[PDB]
Design a protein around this ligand. Structure first.
Ligand code: MG
Ligand code: MG
Ligand code: MG
Ligand code: MG
Ligand code: MG
Ligand code: MG
Ligand code: MG
Ligand code: MG
Ligand code: MG
Ligand code: MG
Ligand code: MG
Ligand code: MG
Lengths: 65, 188, 36, 127
RNA sequence: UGGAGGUGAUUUAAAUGCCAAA
RNA sequence: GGGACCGCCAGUGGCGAAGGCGCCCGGCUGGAACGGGUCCGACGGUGAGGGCCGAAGGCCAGGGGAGCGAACCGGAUUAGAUACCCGGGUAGUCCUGGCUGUAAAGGAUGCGGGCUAGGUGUCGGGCGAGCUUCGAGCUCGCCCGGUGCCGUAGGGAAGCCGUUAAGCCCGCCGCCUGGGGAGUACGGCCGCAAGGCUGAAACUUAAAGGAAUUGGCGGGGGAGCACUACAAGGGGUGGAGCGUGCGGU
């Protein structure tokens, strides 16, 4: 109901129709799957060390080249 | 009303056939015990006897009689896993298949499929020779042994070892297996 | 009919197959009127 | 002891069906398809719909005493496509996440040894 | 380095060329 | 219960005059290669007229009909959509006995013989040497016959071909003579029919045709770039009255 915080640890690359989306690797900080590393798609400027609030932690973005 | 109907079901225990040890293999639900007849359950040979090598051999047991809360089964057929045999067939090798209809000593009708993999591409006459050797060995074994002994030897790999030893004289072999068994009829 | 592989080239003409079909249609009509 | 069942997964390019039965396969425990969890026909084969259907089926199976399942996944096969759709893997992962144990996994797509003739004519779909 | 084959696929719709150059 | 079809192994691999031929066991049968101090003794090449074989489709009688699917019936797309896409569906596709004799039936290359550098794969037979789990096994070299690639002299407009010639030479048959009219008209033969083989003239026209070069273009591929491009944003114009320029009247 409040989401789970995750920390960005690596930047993969830009994607999307107009280069508006970045793909990152994050580590869950809290919850059932705390500690796991998964990849996600982010909209907006982002750098290593930022914290995202994921509403659920079972969807993983498809890998890009 | 749906959950009402589910409460009318009872659980029955399934046992392996007698000559495989007769151990428990699973549980199945049903409300009327007559509905459990002729159900088929598949188990791997690793579950019967513990060994991680024979994890790709699958056996089918069919229920024939129910007494109390127990179900007893018969042997029906045996197969190798698809992913296993799909990894044996390679380019620059030869695959020899042979399918035979046999009758055991005590009047059981069986159909048996055996497979052999050669180290390289070989000529067709050598394939015919190997297939003939397979046929001779299988016919002799069927004439000699009984149903249960034949099945046990087929699944343990004795027949395949004998076939490989006899067929080395035509061409060196990479593998030799009894690929599949299906029962067709039983004595009256 | 006789073969003219030059006719099959598509530059500046329609497809030979359908010209052949049209000619064969035309020859049926002449033959029917001849028998009367 | 241990009540184990079987999860039959049918995956195509248009839908996904998840069907949990008992060990012998003659009794149905639960059954859910992609069209029962989403509203848009375009979303039926999506991985997300597969996750939702798998979770519903797993809950229904768990409340009835099933502990683990062996998995059989198939594409349409036959004279149709031989490749499973995008919803198979998501469905497999979702069953484990819901609390079931996982046994052995295999695919049972029917394969012809030169069977019948497919649709489309000798030129196929021309789009 | 350079070539020859085979199996798969290949996300809506989108026709035309006037005045002129004379 | 039923009808059609034989996956992977499978290989510029094999066999056949060509069309064509792929599950396993048994019977009958055609051709070729290799080995040969065997037999006959020029018995050979090509071949006008003539004969036989010949994918798919079609037709005439009798069966069968799973899947697919001309015609046709519906749903969509569209300006229209007699189509492409979707749901159905008759003939046909399959078996037995005949007829038809057509394909980009293409190696777009008629067949027999002698000769003219090499290099390197692979299939069948034979010979020699070395290994060996003694296997109808493995590796290397040479000879003959098939089947691919690179290439010398030579050839060619070039693309390219090059002992599997499109090279130099000895034979025989078939065919062609600028583009259209036209594979049409008339006549004849064959066929149940659909159709097959043979085949002009009047007139019209300055090119039609081939191989390669430089550009431009593609609802072809790859790399790069731009606030007179987009994405994320800030402010507007298009509605009213007026200032000024333009078309028209
Ligand atoms: Mg010509
Ligand atoms: Mg639906
Ligand atoms: Mg249709
Ligand atoms: Mg279109
Ligand atoms: Mg002759
Ligand atoms: Mg052909
Ligand atoms: Mg050669
Ligand atoms: Mg050359
Ligand atoms: Mg005439
Ligand atoms: Mg602009
Ligand atoms: Mg913008
Ligand atoms: Mg304004």
């Amino acid at each position: 109901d409040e989401g789970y915080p995750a920390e960005v640890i690596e930047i993969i690359g830009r994607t999307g129709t107009t280069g508006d989306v970045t793909q990152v690797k994050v580590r869950i900080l809290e919850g059932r799957d705390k500690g796991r590393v998964i990849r996600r798609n982010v909209r907006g400027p982002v750098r290593v060390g930022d914290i995202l609030i994921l509403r659920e932690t079972e969807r993983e973005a498809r890998e890009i080249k | 009303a749906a959950k009402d109907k589910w409460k009318l079901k009872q659980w029955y225990v399934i046992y392996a056939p007698d000559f495989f040890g007769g151990v428990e293999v699973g549980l199945t639900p049903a409300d009327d015990p007559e509905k459990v007849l002729n159900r088929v359950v598949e188990v791997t040979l690793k579950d019967i006897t513990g060994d991680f090598l024979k994890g790709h051999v699958k056996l089918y047991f069919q229920v024939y009689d129910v007494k109390g809360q127990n179900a007893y089964t018969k042997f029906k057929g045996m197969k190798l896993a698809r992913s296993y045999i799909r990894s044996l067939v390679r380019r620059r090798t030869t695959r020899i298949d042979g399918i035979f209809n046999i009758t055991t000593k005590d009047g059981y009708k069986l159909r048996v499929m055996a497979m052999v993999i050669a180290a390289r591409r070989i000529q067709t006459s050598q394939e015919r020779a190997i297939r003939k050797i397979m046929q001779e060995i299988i016919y002799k074994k069927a004439e000699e042994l009984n149903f249960k002994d034949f099945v046990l030897e087929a699944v343990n790999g004795k027949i395949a070892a004998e076939i490989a030893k006899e067929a080395k004289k035509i061409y060196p072999l990479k593998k030799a297996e009894i690929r599949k068994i299906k029962v067709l009829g039983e004595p009256e | 009919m006789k073969r003219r592989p030059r006719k099959w080239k598509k530059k500046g003409r329609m497809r030979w197959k359908w010209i052949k079909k049209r000619i064969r249609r035309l020859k049926r009509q002449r033959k029917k009127e001849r028998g009367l | 002891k241990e009540k184990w069942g079987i999860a039959h997964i049918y995956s195509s390019y248009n839908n996904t069906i998840i069907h949990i039965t008992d060990i012998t396969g003659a009794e149905t425990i639960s059954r859910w398809s992609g069209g029962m969890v989403v509203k848009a026909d375009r979303d039926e084969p999506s991985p997300y719909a597969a996750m939702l259907a798998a979770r519903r089926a797993a809950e229904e199976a768990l409340e009835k005493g099933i502990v683990g399942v062996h998995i059989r996944v198939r594409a349409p096969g036959g004279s149709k496509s031989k490749t499973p759709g995008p919803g198979a893997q998501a469905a497999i992962r979702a069953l484990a996440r819901a609390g079931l144990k996982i046994g052995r996994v295999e695919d049972v797509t029917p394969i012809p040894h030169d069977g019948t003739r497919p649709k489309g004519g000798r030129r196929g779909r021309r789009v």
